[PDB]
Design a protein around this nucleic acid. Sequence first.
DNA 1: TTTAAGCAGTCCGCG
DNA 2: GCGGACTGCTTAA
Length: 896
Amino acid sequence: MKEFYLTVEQIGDSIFERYIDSNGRERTREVEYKPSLFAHCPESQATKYFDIYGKPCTRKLFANMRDASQWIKRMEDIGLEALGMDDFKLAYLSDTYNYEIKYDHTKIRVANFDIEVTSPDGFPEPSQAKHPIDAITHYDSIDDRFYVFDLLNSPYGNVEEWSIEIAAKLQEQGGDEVPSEIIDKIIYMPFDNEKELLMEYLNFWQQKTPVILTGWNVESFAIPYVYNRIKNIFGESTAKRLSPHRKTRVKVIEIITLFGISVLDYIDLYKKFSFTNQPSYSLDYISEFELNVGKLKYDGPISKLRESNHQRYISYNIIAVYRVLQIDAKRQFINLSLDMGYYAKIQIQSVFSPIKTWDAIIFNSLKEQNKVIPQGRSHPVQPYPGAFVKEPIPNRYKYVMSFDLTSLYPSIIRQVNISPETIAGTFKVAPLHDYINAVAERPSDVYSCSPNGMMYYKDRDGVVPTEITKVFNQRKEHKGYMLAAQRNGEIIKEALHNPNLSVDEPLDVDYRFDFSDEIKEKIKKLSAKSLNEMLFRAQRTEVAGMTAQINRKLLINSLYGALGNVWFRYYDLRNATAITTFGQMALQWIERKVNEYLNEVCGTEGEAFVLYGDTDSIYVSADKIIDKVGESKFRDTNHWVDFLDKFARERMEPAIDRGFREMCEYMNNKQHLMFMDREAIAGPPLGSKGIGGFWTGKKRYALNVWDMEGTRYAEPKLKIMGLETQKSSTPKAVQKALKECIRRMLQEGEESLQEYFKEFEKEFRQLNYISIASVSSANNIAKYDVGGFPGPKCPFHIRGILTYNRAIKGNIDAPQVVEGEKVYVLPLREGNPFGDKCIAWPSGTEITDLIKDDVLHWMDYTVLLEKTFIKPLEGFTSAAKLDYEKKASLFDMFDF
DNA sequence: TTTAAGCAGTCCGCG
DNA sequence: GCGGACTGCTTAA
């Protein structure tokens, strides 16, 4: 098979690589890599290497990587550009795998582990590792087995062996209910003492050295703890065996680097790719959210769980590892990282960096053409102007239709042809509104321009535009393979109904393309065994297709971020500004064209149809469109939705397109790519008293949506942006209540809202304290801690933490609030024994029993309700011109 | 290693 | 009590 790397490191003048050879066997090798860099040379000198500006370069081959680095410094010292890939690992990968990498994940050892450390005197710090490791579950993807290491004897107690039969029994039977599917995959191993457990775990590790190492919070806890515990007991020399190259690097107060291993802590993968913001990141919490699986329940402190219920302690360790696996089975973040890493040809852990990922993608592409990348240069950090956001008039908006531009920034880069080497010059700029109103003179008759004054060549597609266009088109291809494989899968399922009783084999087809009628016919004749094998292949193809297209998507959307980063090799302030400024013109230009068009077709003058707009979208008030015809005319809700859908697709789109083409010519761009499609159609149920939607201000609105891009919903769905219902800092119960209030406003009306408001306010007191607690990240605690008392300008949540700290002092085993993590926050009635107006504790958890009852008895319900629920609800109704309080008479409906 | 914007809360100035 | 500054936090896109 095709060879591919697993990991790569640079240690001195040598590169250490673990890879899968032709035979599919994992190998290792140390190479004295001789890198090359480049420098400009006189024109007279013929060479095949040219930088992106078309200038000739001479190749400099070095004896070792050290010599190359030193050369760069001397060139910097002298003040001349030193071109080429300065990250030698990347250059090494590029030279060694000079082709599109085809990898086989079944050959990559992905390890998922978790440890337990009974610690009576507080949290067991990894840097100290002063307490024995009494449990370790390590799942290996090649073996598909859960290896469990259990310490039976420790200074904290001697226990009996763990029982798998009791582990299997359901909870209602006193068992731990360890998933039936993994029970037969557990390799249990008891140990008489800790030294023996560790020695065997370390041997196990050297035999099955992880390639990808994951788990929950393994980078900040499990890894450093295991490393230091082994170092303190057996010596540093033995601890370094955790690295397949026996090279580690301890980053002082403490992150441990194991060379030859790619660590992808799942907590980081989750934060990087889930596009959410959770109130807590404890595995239990994330687990409930993702899998709806209750919390691994156990009684008492964890520090006494092994001693009191060793059976449960061990099953707890096992299930913790399994949950992460379940999350990944659903999110596929590991496979996404592999797919992305191999596409760019970088160390897999580099997927966390758009800059590193795109630099490699562009490097490999340019190298194939024998071109030489520019030296990375330092730029002063300067913020540039961003997107345009219209100030909306706060109010209710009955009918609304929105339109979105397709991948705006990437599309702008391609249309205008923006790249460092395509800069052709500048033109005299007029105020932005002059280009928006087509008043200013045409910037150029020869170059492609942006309203910020920049001009670019049109004869050639630039480096960045070409690369982004490639990824753009590739996503189309893979998403297409995904869909075809999906459909092809249905055909095979349709056939599995009555499989022939034949002797045959799986048809050798390409599942990325819709089956022809010839293949469909043949499939109708296949046997059950053959068809099932085909369905398996069809699905594997679909999954791969999904992952590739998602990977392509992330790349497309992260390019702009990179281009706006001073550390990116292709960063250019003028180019970043050209992109965003052109984006502002595009949105406001089309806003004008849409208002002009709509006023014309509705036979009216100077009417403002575009009610809002942000970055790449506009929201059109369709009220007058509905009136021009008349509501009575519409049979039912679905009728007017159909009408507006047709009105958009047949009359507005063409006008928007004509509008953008004019703009493209005006700016003399390389090609038209400003495509704006109809997104949502919002409104209240025909007949009802609902208001449909509302805006309270910029980036804060709510809409009752019936159709999203041609997808007609069975039931209208609420699209809420910015409002407290969407914020992780809003208490759970309040998020839900505020959402029902909005639903009632948009779909049913004022009286419906008033009814619900009164009820929630009356039952408020009975809600679980955790459900009505606010949440907040806690940064710089120490900064405001003076003698355990709040200092000047101390934040409300920080004060709460200090209060909690003062009340748990002296209690060695009390849960500690951690710097940079999140906490629940509750206000306290004056006179409370805590000594302050509020208290905070670790989010995603119950507050410690030593003060729980007191907190529950001094919680200030009145302030809670007013601040988290009433204040924001008043803001919604004020903007919507509604009353959340029922009145006694008609005249009471007015502000007399 | 992106910019734009909205709230929660301090801390002050106020005959 | 109420509006500025200004710090902290969190979303939109």
